[PDB]
Amino acid sequence: IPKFFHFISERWPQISQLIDGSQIPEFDNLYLDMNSILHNCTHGRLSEEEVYSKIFSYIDHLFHTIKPKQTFYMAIDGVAPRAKMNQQRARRFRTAMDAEKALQKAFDSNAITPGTEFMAKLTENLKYFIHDKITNDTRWQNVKVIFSGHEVPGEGQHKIMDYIRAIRAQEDYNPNTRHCIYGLDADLIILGLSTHDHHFCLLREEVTTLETQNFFLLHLSILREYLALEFEEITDSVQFEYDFERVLDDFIFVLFTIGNDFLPNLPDLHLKKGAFPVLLQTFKEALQHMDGYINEQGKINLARFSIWLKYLSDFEYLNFEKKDIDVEWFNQQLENISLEGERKRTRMGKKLLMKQQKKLIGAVKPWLLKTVQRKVTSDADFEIFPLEDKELVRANLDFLKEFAFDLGLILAHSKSKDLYYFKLDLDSIXXXXXXXXXXXXXXXXXXXYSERFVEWKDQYYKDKDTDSLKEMTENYVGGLQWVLYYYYRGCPSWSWYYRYHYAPRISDVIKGIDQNIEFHKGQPFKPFQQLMAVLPERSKNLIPVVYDFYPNEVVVKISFVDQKRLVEAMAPYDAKLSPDEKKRNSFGTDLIFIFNPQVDTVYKTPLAGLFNDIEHNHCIEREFIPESMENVKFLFGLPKGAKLGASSLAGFPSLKTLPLTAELAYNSSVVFNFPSKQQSMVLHIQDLYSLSDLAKRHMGKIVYSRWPFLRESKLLSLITEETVYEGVKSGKLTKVIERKPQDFERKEFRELKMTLKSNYQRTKAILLDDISALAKVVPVNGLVRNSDGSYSKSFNETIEYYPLQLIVEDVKNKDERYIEKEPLPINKEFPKGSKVVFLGDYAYGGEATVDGYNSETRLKLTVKKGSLRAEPNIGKVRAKLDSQALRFYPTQXXXXXXXXXXXXXXXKTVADWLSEARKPFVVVSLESDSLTKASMAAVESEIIKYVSLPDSSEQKKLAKVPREAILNAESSYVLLRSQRFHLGDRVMYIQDSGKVPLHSKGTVVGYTSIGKNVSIQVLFDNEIIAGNNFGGRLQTRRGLGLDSSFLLNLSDRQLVY
C-alpha cells in the first residue's frame, strides 16, 4: 500500500531496529519469501555460476543474520490463483515490452515463472546448495530446512502463512514462538499482525555489497503496543466488549480494503497526500457506532462494513467538492471528523437521558396522581416509589431533587444508601384540590449527495444509471471477501477473479453489499496452462515451442483470458510433450532436509566455476514434508498463556516497562529525512520516586538500558548537575564515591541533557520529564573465559549515557546467551573427538582433534598443519610501501591534503573547482583505512601465483598439551575480537559456520569500524563463492568484509603457546 510503511513509521516511530552487529534476539523460525531475491540476483548477461553465486550468498546472508533455532522455511512462487493472473499477465507483458522497447533499441526476466526451463534448473541448483550447507555449516545442522519451491502451487507469502497457521493450530505449539519473515513487501507487516503471535519480526532492507547493506528488524511486539495505544482511547465508548485483538483484526480488514494485490485500488484515496490519518480516523469513529466487530476471523459483516463505508463515502464526496488536495486540507478534515464524532456522541447521550427522563415521569404520573387523591389528616399511610439504578440515580441528583421538589415529593434514601425512593412530602401541609391541580401542572411540565457529483461519477464509469454497476460493485465486494479469506483462512478459490480493470467509486460500493457470498475451492492450473495464461507472444520461447489473447500493444488494459477457450486450444498439443515437460507440467511437494553424521554419499554439482561435488563429507537427506492436520481447528488470536508486554522473552521491545502517558500530537517527528507533517504517538515518561542509595544498590551491577529495547549493561557512574556517584572495584565489592564535577564534566552534563531530551522528542516522539540524573553505562557484549575455566559477562569499552528515568532495574526474562557459567572438566569442555583450534607454534590456527586426556589438566590431540610453506609476503610489503609513500604531518593531515591546499592557493580560485576536486570520496570512520588500489591488485597478483606453488599438509599426534593451547572458536567471539589487525596481516577464518570454508587464509586489505564493531576486509587466498571484487578493485571474487570474531590473525599472533 502506497505510503504505508512511511506512514506507520512516522506515526509509531520506534517500531524498527537497524541490524548493526550488536546483539539481536534469538529466533525460533525464519521464513524466506525468495521471489524478490531471484529477480534481484538476475539483474545488476552474467553466467549461471555468478548468478547462483549471488542467490546462495543472499539466502546464506539472511540465514546467518537471524540464526534460527528450530525451523528455516524457504518459499518460491508456485502457480497463483486466478485472482492474480490478470496482474501476473500485465506485469509479464510490460517486461517483454520494456526489454524490446528500451535496451534492445534505445536475460528474460519472465523466465522466473513456474514451469519454465530456468526454474527446473533453479530447484536442482538450490537443492545442491542446501546439501552443501547442511554438510558443512554447523549452524545449518540443528534446524529443519524446509523448501517449498515453485513445483508447489501458491504464492510464497501465502504458503508461508499456511505453514504458520498450521503449526500454531496444533495442541503443543510453543505459545511464545519467536517468528521472523524476510521480505520486501510492506504487506508482510499486516500478515504478521494477522497471526496474533506477539513475538514476531520482519527482516527488511533500507528504503531511504551485501555485508555493507542495511537490514532492519521491524518489531511487531512494539507495533502492537503502539496500536493498542492508538485505539484504547475508546474502550469506554464502544457498544460491545472491547478487545484489542479484535480491534486489530478490524484494523486489518480496513488496511486490506485500502489496498491489496488482487482488487484494484478504490479511486481518489489520496494517500501520497495525507489521507491516511483521516482514513484511520474514519475507522476510529466507525467502531463506535456499531454492534460488534466487522471481522469474524476473516468473515466480513457487510451490515457493519457499510457503517464504515458511509464515512468513506462522505470522504469521497467532500474531497470532490475541493480544489487541490494537500496535507493542509487533510489536517483540517481530520479535526472536523473528530469534532463531529464528539458532537454525535454527546447528542446520543442527551437522547439516552431524555428516554430515561420519560420512562421516569411515565412511571411516576399514575402513582403520584393516586397519592395526591387523599387529603391530609393527622407517612406510612402512603406508597413509596423505589428507584433501582442507584448508579444512575447518583449521577442525576440535582435533577431528581428538583423533580422531587416540583412534584411535591422527597427523594429519600436509607442509612446504608442501598435503597433510594420517592415519597410524598407529607411534612409540608380545605379545597386543596389545588394541590391535585399543582401536581397535575407540574407533571404536565416534565412530559415536555450533490448532482454535479452524480454526473461526475457517471462520467467516470462511462469513461472506463444501470445495474451492470450492481454487477461491477458486487464483483468488488466479493473481492474484499476473497482477500480477507485468503489471508485469514487460506485460498478460498483457485478461480475467482475481479473482472474489471477499475474499482467503483467509493460512494457506490454500497450497491454491492446486497449479496450472499460463497466460493468454490476449484483447483490450480497445470503449470503450462498458467504459463500460457501469462506471458506474451514476445517471450514465446520459454513455452515449450509447440504452442488473439496476445497483443503487441496494450494501468495495463490487457484483456482477460477466456480459460475454457484456453485449456481446450492447448489439448490438441497436449499429448505431444516430452517426458521432461510432463515432468515440468505437474506438481511437486514440499521438501525437508536433515543432518545425519552416519550419511556419507557423493553429491554431484549442477554448476561450473567455483563449485565442486560434495564428497565423503556429504551428510544430508531430502524427503517429502507432510504437516499432520487432523480434526484440528485454526487458532485465531493469542494462544493460551502467551507472554506479553513486560513478560515478553528477552530481546523483544516493550513500552510497558516504564510508567508513561501517550497522546497523539503534531510532534514534527524525524524518522527518515524530513519532519513528518502528521501526528505521532508521543510518549510522556514519568520519573520514578534516595539518589544516594540508588547508586549504592546498582553501582557496577547489571541495570537495563536502551529502554524500548532493554538490554543488560553495567552501571558506572551517576552524573548530576552538582554530584558524581562513582564505582570502584574494591576487589570483591564495588563501592560508591560521591564528589563534585570537574569543569568538563559539568560542561558535558549540561550539553548532554539538552541533547538527549530533544533527540528523544525529535527522533522517537519520547517527551522526557526533564533530566534529573544520568546513568552512565556499558552494555553486555558477550561472555568471556577467565583463567580458572569459568565464563563471565564481557562489556563493550564504549560509554553510553541515558537519562535515569529510562533505566529499568530488572526484567522477567533474561537473555540466556549471557547467563554466566561455572568451570567445566576437560572431557566436557573439550570432549573426545571435539574439533578445536590449535594455538601454539607448531600450527597456529591448526585443526585439532581431542583424542583423550593425559591428566585432568592436560590433553592429547591430532593437529593438522594445513601448509608446510611460508606465509606469503605482499600484504606486509605493501602496507609499508603505502605508509612510506604517503607521509602524514601534525598541524603544528596528508601530503595529498598539502597538494590540494597548494593547488587551490596557486589556483586564487573558487568555488565549484573545489566541489569538482571532492569527487573521489575517501569518507569513513576514524580508525579505519586501506591499501592503495595499486597495492590491492599487486596483492591479488602475487597471491594468485603463490596459491599455485606446490604445497602439502601434515598431521602430528600431540600430547601433554595444556588447555590453553587450544580454543573453541565457537564460544570465543570476544577474545577473537580483542585482536589487533593491520593492513597486510595474514589471516585465517576460524569459525565452523558462515560464508567462508573453515581454515581459509587471506590477507587483510583494509579495516572498517562502525564505532565498536570492527569489520575486517579480507582478500582471500582462494576465491570465495560468497565474495566480491571490492567494486572493481579486484579481478576475481577473492573479497569479503567480515567481523573480527571470525578471524585468527597469523602475522600478529596474539594467542600463541
Name the residue nearer to Mn ion (CB basis): 187 or 847: 187
Q: Which is nearer to Mn ion, 261 or 745 (CB)?
A: 261
Bridge partner list, 503:
none
Considering beta carbons, is residue 7 or 802 the nearer one to Mn ion? 7
E-strand spans in 920-1055?
957-962, 966-967, 986-989, 1001-1010, 1013-1020, 1039-1043, 1047-1049
CB of 178 to Mn ion, least distance (A): 23
Q: Is 4 in the site for Mn ion (CB under 5 A)?
A: no
Applying CB under 5 A, does 663 fall inside the site for Mn ion?
Answer: no
Beta bridge partners, 727, equal 736
The residue (of 252 and 1034) whose beta carbon lies closer to Mn ion is: 252
What does the buried/exposed string (b/e) look like for 653-674 if buried means 16 or more CB atoms within 10 Å of the residue's CB?
Answer: bbbebbeeebebeebebbbeee
Applying CB under 5 A, the site for Mn ion has a residue count of: 3
Which one of the spans 259-267, 405-413, 796-804, 1020-1028 is the region binding Mn ion (CB under 5 A)?
Answer: 259-267
Question: Which residue type does 179 have?
Answer: H
Instruction: From 211-219, 227-235, 255-263, 619-627, give the range in contact with Mn ion by CB under 5 A.
Output: 255-263
Q: Is 187 part of any known ligand binding site?
A: yes
Q: With respect to Mn ion, which residue has the nearer C-beta, 1 or 699?
A: 1
Cβ contact 611:47 at 8 Å: no
Rank residues 261 and 1052 by Cβ distance to Mn ion and give the closer one. Answer: 261
Q: Interface residues for Mn ion in 574-633 (CB under 5 A)?
A: none
Nearest approach in angstroms of CB 157 to Mn ion is 6
**Residue 652 beta carbon to Mn ion: minimum distance, rounded to whole angstroms:** 25
CA distance 813 to 819: 11
Residue nearest to Mn ion (CB): 187
Q: What is the DSSP-derived secondary structure letter of residue 109? A: G
Place of cell 601448509: 867
**Preceding omega of 275 cis (within 30 degrees of 0):** no
CA atoms in the 13 A half-sphere facing the CB of 308: 26
| 35 versus 1017: smaller Cβ distance to Mn ion | 35
**What HEC string does 218-261 produce?**
EEHHHHHHHHHHHHHCCCCCCCCCCCHHHHHHHHHHHHHHHCCC
- Find the part of the chain contacting Mn ion (CB under 5 A) among 52-60, 256-264, 940-948, 987-995: 256-264
Residue 1042 in grid coordinates: 567480515
Of 94 and 858, nearer to Mn ion (C-beta) is 94
Q: How far is the CB of 115 from Mn ion (least distance, A)?
A: 22
Look-up of cell digits 582462494: 1022
Q: Minimum CB separation from Mn ion for residue 187, in Å?
A: 3
> Among residue numbers 990 through 1029, which ones bind Mn ion (CB under 5 A)?
none
Minimum separation from the CB atom of position 1000 to Mn ion (A): 40
Of 723, 769, 728, 713, residue with least CA distance to 749: 723
**Which residue's entry shows cell 395526591?**
372
SS3 per residue for 117-174: HHHHHHHHHHHHHHHHHHHHCHHHCCCEEEEECCCCCCCHHHHHHHHHHHHHCCCCCC
Minimal distance, residue 191 CB to Mn ion, in Å: 8
Q: b or e along 596-622 (b: 16 or more beta carbons within 10 Å of the residue's beta carbon)?
A: eeeeeeebebebeebbeebeeebbbee
Binders of Mn ion among 169-188, rule CB under 5 A? 185, 187
DSSP state of 955: -
Helix axis angle for 469-489 and 187-195, nearest 10°, is 60
User: Taking a C-beta distance cutoff of 8 angstroms, is the pair 716, 710 a contact?
Assistant: no
CB of 185 to Mn ion, least distance (A): 4
Smallest separation (angstroms) from Mn ion to the CB of 269: 17
Q: Say how far apart CA 364 and CA 361 lie, in whole Å.
A: 5
Give me the least distance between CB of 455 and Mn ion, in Å please. 36
CB within 8 Å of 380: residues ≥ 6 apart: none
CB 957 within 8 A of CB 865: no
Query: Residue 330 and residue 279: Cα distance in Å, rounded?
Result: 10
Closest separation in Å from C-beta 186 to Mn ion: 8
CA angle 829, 834, 838 (to 5 degrees): 90
Does the protein bind Mn ion through residue 261 (CB under 5 A)?
A: yes
Of 781, 712, 715, 720, the residue nearest 748 (C-alpha) = 720
Task: Give the distance from CA 765 to its chain's centroid.
Answer: 20
Of 182 and 330, CB closest to Mn ion: 182
What would the x/- binding string for Mn ion be over residues 210 to 249, using CB under 5 A?
----------------------------------------
Q: Which is nearer to Mn ion, 255 or 275 (CB)?
A: 255
951 among annotated binding-site residues: no
Check residue 316 for interaction with Mn ion (CB under 5 A): no
CA distance 698 to 694: 6
Taking contact as CB under 5 A, which single stretch among the options 93-101, 257-265, 633-641, 946-954 is the one that binds Mn ion? Answer: 257-265
Q: Do 422 and 411 touch, CB atoms closer than 8 A?
A: yes
Cβ closest to Mn ion, residue 64 vs residue 84: 84
Query: Least distance in Å: CB of 664 to Mn ion?
Result: 28
Considering beta carbons, is residue 261 or 1043 the nearer one to Mn ion? 261
Tell the smallest beta-carbon distance from residue 155 to Mn ion (Å): 8
**Is the Cβ of residue 259 or residue 803 nearer to Mn ion in the bound state?**
259
Does the footprint of Mn ion cover residue 33 (CB under 5 A)? no
Say how many C-beta atoms besides its own lie within 10 A of residue 855's C-beta: 10
Identity of the residue, 187 or 285, whose beta carbon is nearer to Mn ion in the bound complex: 187
Is 417 buried (19+), middle (13-18) or exposed (0-12) by CB count in 10 A? exposed
Over the range 543-575, which residues count as b (16 or more CB within 10 Å of their CB) and which as e? bbeeeebeeeeeeeebebbeeeeeeeebeeeee
CB of 476 to Mn ion, least distance (A): 18
CA distances to 36, 54, 58, 180, 274 from 40, rounded to whole Å, are 6, 9, 10, 21, 31
CA–CA separation, 1047 and 987 (whole Å):
6
Q: Quick check: helix, strand or coil at residue 746?
A: helix
Cβ proximity to Mn ion, 87 vs 1044, nearer residue: 87
| Residue 197 lies near Mn ion (rule: CB under 5 A) | no
Angle, helix 48-66 to helix 35-42, in steps of 10 degrees:
140
185 is in an annotated binding site: yes
Positions 122 through 141 that interact with Mn ion (CB under 5 A): none
Q: How far is the CB of 493 from Mn ion (least distance, A)?
A: 18
Binding residues: 185, 187, 261
Which positions touch Mn ion (CB under 5 A)? 185, 187, 261
Binding residues for Mn(2+): 185, 187, 261
